[PDB]
Structure formats: structure tokens, C-alpha cells
Design a protein around this motif. Sequence first.
Motif, short mmCIF file in Angstrom:
data_model
loop_
_atom_site.label_atom_id
_atom_site.label_comp_id
_atom_site.label_asym_id
_atom_site.label_seq_id
_atom_site.Cartn_x
_atom_site.Cartn_y
_atom_site.Cartn_z
N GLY A 52 32.51 29.36 19.03
CA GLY A 52 33.84 28.81 18.89
C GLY A 52 34.89 29.90 18.83
N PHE A 53 35.98 29.63 18.11
CA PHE A 53 37.07 30.59 17.98
C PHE A 53 36.91 31.44 16.73
CE2 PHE A 53 38.11 28.42 14.34
CZ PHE A 53 39.39 28.66 13.84
N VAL A 54 37.72 32.48 16.62
CA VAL A 54 37.70 33.37 15.47
C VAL A 54 39.01 34.14 15.33
CG1 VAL A 54 36.76 35.52 14.57
CG2 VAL A 54 35.22 33.71 15.24
N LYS A 55 39.57 34.09 14.13
CA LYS A 55 40.80 34.81 13.83
C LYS A 55 40.42 36.25 13.53
CE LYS A 55 44.70 32.37 13.77
NZ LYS A 55 45.98 32.80 14.39
N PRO A 81 28.82 38.41 13.38
CA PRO A 81 27.50 38.81 12.90
C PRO A 81 26.92 40.02 13.63
CG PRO A 81 27.31 36.88 14.24
CD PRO A 81 28.78 37.07 14.00
N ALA A 82 27.71 40.62 14.51
CA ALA A 82 27.27 41.79 15.25
C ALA A 82 28.45 42.61 15.74
CB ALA A 82 26.40 41.37 16.43
N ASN A 83 28.37 43.93 15.58
CA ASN A 83 29.45 44.79 16.04
C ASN A 83 29.32 44.93 17.55
OD1 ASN A 83 30.63 45.33 13.47
ND2 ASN A 83 29.06 46.87 13.05
N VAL A 84 30.44 44.79 18.25
CA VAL A 84 30.44 44.85 19.70
C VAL A 84 31.46 45.80 20.34
CG1 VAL A 84 31.01 43.51 21.77
CG2 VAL A 84 29.42 42.59 20.11
N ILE A 85 30.99 46.56 21.32
CA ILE A 85 31.85 47.47 22.07
C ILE A 85 31.97 46.83 23.44
CG2 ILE A 85 32.01 49.73 23.16
CD1 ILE A 85 30.32 50.78 20.78
N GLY A 86 33.19 46.41 23.78
CA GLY A 86 33.41 45.75 25.06
C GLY A 86 33.73 46.67 26.22
N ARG A 87 34.08 46.05 27.35
CA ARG A 87 34.41 46.76 28.57
C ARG A 87 35.70 47.57 28.45
NH1 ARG A 87 35.95 44.20 32.16
NH2 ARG A 87 36.30 42.05 31.46
N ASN A 88 36.52 47.25 27.45
CA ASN A 88 37.77 47.96 27.25
C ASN A 88 37.49 49.41 26.82
OD1 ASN A 88 36.87 47.10 24.57
ND2 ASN A 88 38.90 47.73 23.84
N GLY B 51 32.10 32.61 16.45
CA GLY B 51 32.52 31.23 16.24
C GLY B 51 31.45 30.35 15.62
N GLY B 52 30.19 30.56 15.99
CA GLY B 52 29.15 29.74 15.40
C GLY B 52 27.87 29.57 16.19
N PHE B 53 27.26 28.39 16.04
CA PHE B 53 26.00 28.08 16.71
C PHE B 53 26.18 26.90 17.66
CE2 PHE B 53 23.63 24.22 15.00
CZ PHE B 53 24.80 23.53 14.71
#
Lengths: 99, 99
Positions: A52-55, A81-88, B51-53
Motif C-alpha cells: 500500500g502507501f507509506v508516509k 521492513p527493509a532498507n532499499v537503495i533505488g535506481r536514483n 505498505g503491507g501484505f
Amino acid sequence: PQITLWQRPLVTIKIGGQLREALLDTGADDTIFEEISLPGRWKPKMIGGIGGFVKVRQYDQIPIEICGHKVIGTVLVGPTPANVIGRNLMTQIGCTLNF
Amino acid sequence: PQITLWQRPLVTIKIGGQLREALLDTGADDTIFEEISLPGRWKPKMIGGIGGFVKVRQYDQIPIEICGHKVIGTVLVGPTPANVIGRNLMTQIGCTLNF
Ligand SMILES: CC(C)c1nc(CN(C)C(=O)N[C@H](C(=O)N[C@@H](Cc2ccccc2)C[C@H](O)[C@H](Cc2ccccc2)NC(=O)OCc2cncs2)C(C)C)cs1
């Protein structure tokens, strides 16, 4: 280096004087961390995933050290729930997919 | 193929006689497809992300054709804003991450 994918593509990160592990995520447009303190102003922002969404909080011009490389870019900090390094950021260190 | 990351890493797929576009996603363990029709019985599985599951159907041993490469693997079908080819299938075509 070359990264096989039989395991999660995890790299060690140095950001804001804080050490953490992140996932090289090609399926992510931006970078997002769950719990790190960054100085300066930030802009409220919302990102979406499969759940879903996330602030999240947006911070720009942040120097981050990826696997021994110094890069600067926009970093998002919010519940994840996980650290992410994107394409940016992956484009700044010359990451490419290969097969 | 060598693909840079200035654009989302999309590839064309033929699955169950249907044509789709999917994102090569190193940050995903499993392959997720939004609504497509697949044979046989499944198993109600749940996955999580930002966002969730979400509740999905797990199909095992389904043949997929990525860039002309045909491989058989587990495919999850369920509500998702984007088709994703995870590591479970990316290792099949010897896809590596380089920088
Ligand atoms: C707990 C943690 C240590 C981990 N669990 C896992 C196992 N899980 C659940 C997954 O791999 N789950 C996958 C997933 O959502 N992966 C995600 C990384 C992640 C992993 C775990 C928890 C939270 C985020 C990574 C995927 O590239 C998705 C793809 C995508 C893009 C647009 C719309 C929908 C989907 N990326 C996002 O949702 O990115 C959101 C963004 C962040 N910054 C910018 S956009 C599913 C597609 C299967 C790996 S690491």
C-alpha cells in the motif's frame, strides 16, 4: 563487483555517520531507510509498494557511502521492513543488470 | 543484455500464452504478476512489502519466456501495481548485478 542473485543483494552503507545494510533494489525508483537520523529540512512524501502507501520524509543532497563509494542524492526515511537503495543512487555508482 | 538503470528495467514476457511487461526486480525474492490466467491448482499465499501484505495465488512449475529465454518456476498472482520478475527466476537466466 559482480553480484549473483542466489542471495539478497545486500551492501553495507555509511550514511549520516551511521552504518547499515541495504538491498540493491532495481525494482525501486527511490531509496528508503527505516530508522536513521538525518539533519536538515525534509518534505513529507508518500510512496507505494505491493502492500500500500507509506508516509515518508524526503531529504535531498545527502552524502551516502555505498560499498566504499561516495554518492549524493535524495534519501527517503520512513516505515519499511527493509532498507532499499533505488535506481536514483544505483546510476551514480554505475550499476547495470546483466544476462 | 546489459541494461543501465536510468529507466525502469522492463522486459517483455510470454506467460500462459499471454504477453506481459515485467520489471526485473533484484529486491524481490518471488515473481509477482497482476492478473493473468494460469492453469492448475494453487495455494493461498501471502507476501509483504511497503505498505503491507497481500493475498496471492501460488502457482508452481509454470513456464515463462523472458527475452526468448524459457524457464519454469513459481509464479505468484495477485493484486500488484506492477509485474515483477524476482530473484527466483532471475538466477535461471544467469542475471547478475554489476558496478
Ligand atoms: C524483511 C526483509 C529483511 C525482507 N523480506 C524480503 C521478502 N519479501 C517480502 C519480498 O522480497 N517482497 C517483495 C517486495 O515487495 N520487495 C520490495 C522490497 C521490500 C522487501 C521486503 C519488505 C519491504 C520491501 C522491492 C520491490 O522492488 C518493489 C517493487 C514495486 C514497484 C512499484 C509498485 C509495486 C512494487 N519496490 C517498492 O515497492 O518500492 C517502494 C519504494 C521505495 N522507494 C521508492 S519506491 C515482493 C514483490 C515479493 C526480502 S528482504
